[PDB]
Amino acid sequence: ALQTIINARLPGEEGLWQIHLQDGKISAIDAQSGVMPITENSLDAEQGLVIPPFVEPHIHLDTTQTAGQPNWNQSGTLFEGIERWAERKALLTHDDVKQRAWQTLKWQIANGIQHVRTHVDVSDATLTALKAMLEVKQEVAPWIDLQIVAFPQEGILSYPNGEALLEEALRLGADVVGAIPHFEFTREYGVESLHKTFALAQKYDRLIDVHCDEIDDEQSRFVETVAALAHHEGMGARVTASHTTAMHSYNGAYTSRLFRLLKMSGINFVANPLVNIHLQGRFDTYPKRRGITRVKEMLESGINVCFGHDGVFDPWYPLGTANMLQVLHMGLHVCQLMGYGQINDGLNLITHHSARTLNLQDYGIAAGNSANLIILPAENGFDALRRQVPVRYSVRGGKVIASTQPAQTTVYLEQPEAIDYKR
Template structure:
């Protein structure tokens, strides 16, 4: 099978991509536009891109907004209260139905890898059990990582540490935490040490909800980065949200960034969520409350973007479109120069793959033929158009396809691979 007249990121010429046995067998530059032949797909100059990745979402909570009550204030902490009301209603069928619906929504928008958090401050651990089972069932269709996440605090919730270990025994891929939500700073710091110890004991990755607050004195990020540095674990460690960084002064940040860069940790920002949850105590001037995405990128620190929530107690909107999330980030973080646009897709593709430690990701000879077809010829045009993902292919098989007029099949029954 061949894709012809394809664009690749950061390359001006047209390409032909040959797929054999579910892998990229050849990637060759074309000498001009090729005519359609049997068994080929004319991509019409659209961008063939590595699949989108959703590195931060809560599938166990998705599609629960208003159940049993709406978050009327729209705040982070009322969201946690509303979720505490919803947790007793959880069961396997409930979580499975909502998670599958949300995964399908993401797949329809070009996502082929997901990292989901699952609440461990629930004695039944039903979210962890159900999502780990779904991960195993769907492994041929999507890459799914499950984070054991102590929503109410690993040390502040009764038996929270034992529940975390049980979640890891069940099979969670990533150790999570929420140090700023622990009762005291001492408990927050202790939780980080325990997170790192558990990650080493069980050979797991780390992803911490870190300083998701406006408080400029919430500085667990430096503690996490220092532990990651001293334990030589930086590439396996992720700090999510870090919204307090938007309230740090520049003198402190100049010192902090040296540690962050040396530690090698990854960052995930969720701009659509943070822009409405943070800054709630401000009148005017009013903080944006999103971490320093632009500065992290300029410092060559790995940062990627996630949606965090889709129709849940914390965020009652959401449509599964990472291009929308990227658009928000560029506006909110004032990354509006052409060079920002030119590499924008990194934050929902390559950077996320690095954060999740995905192997054999990207459009290269020998890699699995996993890709999406986007409406545009480069990052800038795709971003500006905000069009639908035209096609998603995994291991050489079509898993989603839209049919604009300019996409022409010679043989409609032909399947990739």
């Protein structure tokens, strides 16, 4: 079994490092003064970057892989997506959900993602997708720690037996309580739904992840209730507000007042760049707003924010290969986090910040932690992002669970020349 990871670069650290492994855990981390020779039981990072696993804090594995079945969304609109999904009703079965979820999960494993939080629609009396996902969670456990959010897609108070179904999902094992206040019939139902969500989270000792203010409505401010209730219960770490795209449209004065509460509350924020740029701003003509939450300001204020892919190859987001560096690339551009350091530190948005969002207790390259880490064939975060590098090796429990042999490009000039896109 692997005993050491050598010649590793670490974000924010100078030089090369050696990571000693023992019994599936990291036993020690020592600096090197030069390049170490490879040997049996040693995985050579070859001066590449070693980081804890990529994390997917927000994805919908119950709808993934269905784009084009039976028809494609030609307009690319949310409205048509709903219609196209409805046309696939007959195919939505236990086995179908498991098959599609597993397909995307395999892409995630290949992409060095070892932690995934999937929302699952529980506005379904049969709870078909949930029962399927609970089995998938057990099956994929050796490679990915999957969290399931009981997501009341049609509302808690605005859907028949919505609250009862949400609680049933928790009784069946869902890890996180979801909500969607801006989709409830009224602002009052929205606020009330959050009180019910928090009550359930405290009753069952579960995390919370709200689809919060995902709308270009400057009056959608459910985020303040999410943060206030978290602060009141002293449970910020266990709470997440997903999307908050409405924040992109708030006036600056309210946002400034709100930020004090956001920081004090300690709650987490998830932005989903690929989907947000696609679905937001659809009611604008020109100019058209970007519609992503205030990521840059959150980072400047020390508020934990991270990036999710949200949808993969489905009616609402037709693209994706479940690649976090791709999600990061889009987020850095749309959020204008384009300074060298901002780009280089970008990896935090798809690693450490996301681990905090999932309230992970065993994450990071540190002595005592499980030997879960990935190797990127790049010098630093900037380089990894610029070249959209694959994951050379993914290690879990001290064992390699995925590897990618990089593409080899050659140009035939007066003589053949290898091209690696580095200067």
